Symmetry: C3
């Protein structure tokens, strides 16, 4: 009935129950906020000068942005993580030059695993859903403040890693992307006026440290260097590589051959399913039509077929089951059999979006004169939602391409997000089949599968990683970083990247998305404090 209740029935040394509480350097932290100086030398540049006899060291840079009230007519929304997308380049410099600098996309890539930093930058239904303005005085977006955590190497080990000011003046320079990049809008929205009236209103905050009798020592800093290859060039080279801690490789789409218009956008909801659902919903109004006689308002190239008694409409080998309840006696159910279609020859394989549907059910509403769709069985993927509208009507297409109504075409959105990777909005599709990295003429690393991305994701505990070669497994700040080292005499002083892209059919519109290869190299530098703060490249 009862049981024995006894404790620990299984029982030069280092003390694990006590430690000597070390007295630290005497200091005082302070959250300091500064207004900048705006310049259009006509790209927007904000400059922040930090010069104080009491600020001995600093870290944890946060940039505030006052987003204005948006008024007028049309559809408008901000890209997710708007604050990060605003950033083109961040530079930290002293009297001796640049101490540390980064491209906007690399800063974003460095913070992509930090949920809190991403939320602060602007990720909400209020900002990211596509809002509509009905009158010229209607408020589309209310004023808002976003916060961008400018992650720097000075944050790694808090005070130990902090940037020390050796009686030197520090300047933080932020270069901004055009407002076109951070905004999703329809043609109805007056962007011309918005672009003229929009001003970047920034404020820089940092944690400053007032230190008594600071004992400065030399340190090491990893400075990222980005190299972008030519359009559709599967190579890129990083020259003068002497001491690198890591190398990252990824693809970016190039939409210069398009008007940057897309059929749909999910808004705040960013899952793969949300992108697909938003796209399906945009097509359904033109796909299944309840009309009195053949539907009007569609191009002559459109092939709208009346749905038979059994509900099955055949588009070649593809069968589409369409069944709508409460259809008026004077009306019939019609299926648009070629809503979007692409073909390079008149008798080639045809990519038809209408063939990607297998079952469509719903109920017609007499009160609203609309079909309310219940269940949709389809094979629409993330690539479909990522096809620019221009690619459906490119010269390579022998067909009209876009057989949608003028109403649907007017609802198309301009998406100019500067940090898109791969060939889709989610970077789901891996389009690199093979990766080869050369240090000089010698093959340093090669792979036929994304094992370097698997390791990057595993080691960094992230789900949005890249093909990365890490040379440094040594703890940061407390140790001098381990690096791949050059041999100038043998010609091993450069990193050459070569990729082999995955293949596709010529009759798929996404085949024509132009790609650029991006190579990121982290070079090791020495931080010295002789005559103010200065950095020296390790060679």
């Amino acid at each position: 009935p009862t049981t024995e209740n006894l404790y620990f029935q299984g029982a030069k040394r280092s003390n694990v129950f006590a430690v000597d509480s070390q007295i630290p350097t005497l200091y005082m932290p302070q959250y300091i906020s500064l207004s900048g100086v705006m310049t259009n030398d006509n790209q927007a540049i904000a400059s922040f000068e930090i010069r104080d006899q009491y600020i001995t060291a600093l870290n944890h840079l946060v940039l505030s942005l006052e987003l204005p009230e948006v008024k007028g007519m049309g559809r408008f929304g901000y890209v997710p993580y708007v604050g990060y997308k605003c950033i083109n380049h961040v530079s930290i410099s002293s009297c001796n030059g640049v101490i540390w600098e980064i491209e906007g996309e690399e800063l974003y890539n460095n913070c992509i695993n930090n949920t809190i930093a991403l939320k602060h930058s602007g990720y909400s239904s209020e900002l990211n859903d596509i809002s509509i303005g009905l009158t010229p005085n209607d408020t589309i977006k209310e004023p808002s403040t976003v916060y961008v955590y400018i992650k720097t190497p000075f944050d790694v080990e808090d005070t130990f890693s902090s940037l020390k000011l050796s009686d030197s003046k520090i300047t933080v320079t932020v270069t901004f992307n055009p407002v076109s990049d951070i905004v999703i809008r329809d043609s109805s929205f007056d962007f011309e006026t918005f672009n003229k009236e929009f001003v970047y209103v920034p404020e820089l905050s940092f944690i400053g440290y007032m230190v008594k009798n600071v004992q400065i020592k030399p340190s090491f800093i990893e400075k990222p260097r980005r190299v972008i290859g030519q359009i559709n060039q599967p190579t890129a080279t990083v020259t003068e590589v002497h001491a690198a801690t890591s190398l990252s490789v990824y693809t970016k789409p190039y939409y210069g051959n398009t008007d940057n218009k897309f059929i749909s956008y999910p808004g705040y909801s960013q899952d793969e399913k949300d992108y697909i659902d938003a796209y399906v919903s945009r097509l359904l109004d033109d796909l299944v039509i309840v009309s009195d006689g053949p539907p009007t308002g569609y191009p002559e190239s459109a092939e709208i077929v009346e749905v038979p008694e059994d509900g099955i409409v055949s588009i070649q080998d593809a069968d589409v089951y369409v069944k709508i309840d409460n259809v008026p006696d004077n009306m019939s159910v019609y299926l648009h059999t070629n809503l979007l279609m692409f073909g390079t020859r008149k008798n080639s394989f045809i990519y038809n979006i209408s063939k990607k549907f297998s079952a469509i059910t719903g109920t017609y509403s007499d009160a609203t004169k609309r079909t309310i769709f219940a269940h949709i069985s389809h094979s629409i993927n993330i690539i479909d939602t990522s096809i620019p509208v221009s690619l459906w009507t490119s010269q390579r297409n022998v067909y009209n391409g876009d057989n949608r109504s003028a109403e649907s075409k007017a609802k198309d959105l301009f998406i100019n997000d500067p940090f898109i990777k791969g060939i889709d909005f989610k970077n789901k599709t891996d389009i690199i089949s093979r990766l080869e990295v050369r240090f000089g003429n010698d093959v340093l690393y090669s792979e036929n599968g994304p094992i370097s991305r698997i390791y990057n994701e595993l080691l960094t505990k992230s789900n949005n990683g890249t093909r990365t070669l890490t040379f440094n497994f040594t703890p940061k700040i407390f140790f001098r970083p381990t690096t791949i080292t050059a041999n100038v005499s043998r010609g091993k002083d450069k990193l050459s990247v070569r990729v082999v892209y995955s293949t596709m059919g010529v009759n798929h519109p996404i085949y024509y998305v132009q790609k650029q290869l991006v190579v990121v190299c982290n070079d090791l530098y020495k931080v010295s404090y002789d005559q103010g703060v200065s950095i020296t490249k390790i060679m």
Copy 2:
């Protein structure tokens, strides 16, 4: 395959202090303002050190009629105060809200405390013998400074009796219920059944050293007063400032509650759903059962009903020929003066679509286009029918009013259930007469959230960026001669107009200060304030 150096591929495996851990569970002693207090005495010649306190709570079976559910994270909400003391006095103590604030970034601890559809959805009892809630056990992780560096930070018992005292909040605070639920009986029959668990360490030849502890001190400002002061500040590691609503001027009743689903959208959807039954009515002639002050207008053929400048589009399918569609144009209305601004909830709707069901004699709503916000869902029912209001205010059916819920959660912040609305426009902190810190925007909250990796932080000034346990914490230090020995906080509140019911939600300013103490083990365990 394709200079003095520190070894990074090998280490000398140090032999640690000889010890044995044990998970120890203890029943307490219950005491009763008649507030429930549980006392747990820890003393054993073999328990040398302890940490990782976990309090278990046996939630009973809930039977009877009416609507009932538990607040999310029920276990944390149960806690009013936790005290850890020896023969020499309090070693460490915390207010229930501060413990919860300290664990808010720990998903596992929050889940263990009681966060499930079984506990947090509002269940209904149909008969006096019907089970509303099944019995359940919740676990509250009592985070203490002794957990930071595991064995290194652990509380050492120097042959002294350690007492863990847990003060409980009244059961009213942890429960969400309607008027039909017999709370009077539940409150009389409810007993807190706690059990304290901890990781005990039997240590052979322990070498105790002096240490430091940060003890939180809380100051609550006078109701609606935008100032609070913390006296005798000599060595503080941090200072936190936040606002709480005070519902003493109300019956603590709210129209809706989302249950287990806790997103901002879930709160809004639950509210919209509760209003829709009285908002759009399919009736044979003018609808009955509504107050005289109700302005229920028949929807015209174009579907548009105008409430001043606001147009509401109403379209219901399958409406019987003998019936018509009606719109309640003043479901909830507020104004301090007649022929002036009106806060009308019916005006917060732009489009309502649905289909009438002949089988259930109800409208099944399809799509709703509205501007209902989190503040609307956070308005107590009492503020709609208050004396300040020139209107009747609550023009809902008796059926809807009967579905209202009592919400007494003790850890609500700001003026809404999600703490979404920032009501602090300016914060000023003074150390003596000198301005230590001032801000407009909540940059101190942004830093708190970044540095503590939490999405629900507070306006916090951190003075200590030194690693804990291994170093003596960095503090803001007093100057008694210069009068710099107190922290004075002044806030400037942003306001929603006087014709907004939420203006009448009273505010409490909360100031939390972490004072540094020395921990010595000379004749028992004792703490000394650093001065």
Copy 3:
């Protein structure tokens, strides 16, 4: 005046000179005819290694029938992993323990195969139709060498390291209906593995002795509430959990949610599978159901009474020539004719919907029910078992044909989510002495908090000392006093004989982590030439 430690600067220590490399190797396949992959690691430049990742090429699946992979397919493929040298095994693990060790690692679980593409149950309509496209999954083989990166890495002291992976039969990793030609799939399926690791080329490595925790598993007898781990001398931890045993069944279940794995998803998938047979809109009494079925016409008030249980059924747009019917005994179980009856139809209180004239189907709107996770976890075999006095399964032949074979090897408890805690009391003895006892799972709570996991097990941790840098703290044996074994005794929760889940057989699982010393033997040896 006071001596202060510098918190604004540090002396950047120069580390051991090394170079890392991601190395991938193909194995050697062997064939109880269980698949075994062997990977030999021997190099003059590879000094140390860690972070083992196994790749698996999943083939294209063609044909007819319903087919899907279990969530985290890659981990479920693994029966056993062994890392050995010329001196024997260095470290080894059972597949379930590897999975249990990685269950708190979201990234590793995602890489192993967790997607709608893999885990939703796909349907093949023609013998040439593609059910699943080819895919590659990655299994992170977590080892003690990963804890402190380079410091913890496996040092291969001029020896040949062999990584041996034993695979589970493909039946375990696949969910399929009767229509799916499993016989052919099983014959044609081949495990195609590749091992990757992070290798380190180290200049002048200074190897030191270390410690390793090796997991050991003991599975108790079917339905026995006891298990014993013998020869326990230095253990760092002990875990206790339960596994169901489905040997007495055909491993068939009514429903499966696919990729969506929440408790609600399992319940919703089950409710959806039953609704077509539960509420029927028919012209006269419904046909195609067994004679034992009691399908009652729904009255004007909408209330149908099944003993004390009232079911409210209201369907809109029902044709005038048709009526609404309720299957009052869809699934029923009882051991004695006049005793308790477990009836799934009684677990419903309200069903609303609208009949579709276009598709000749009822589209259900709102369902008020008390269906739980246990209901979704009942094998179909128990409803039609010999113990049952009733027919049991009164569903249509259409519904019965949609049943799925689920053979996942890592199921714990008595339900798919391991939600039901069937252990009322736990007692652990070290020899004759009670080492630990608990009623509620406070040891699971501590495991979940300390390891930051939401799917922990009742675990007793003896080591709170930092790993690698310190020799682990252990529970130590006393052979003379008989304290050299860990005996686990549980008190199982009591369930009703008229409840089908009562007949799900249970096995008690006990995991022990034994401490081992890792040494590097160097010496001169002579051999006579022969």
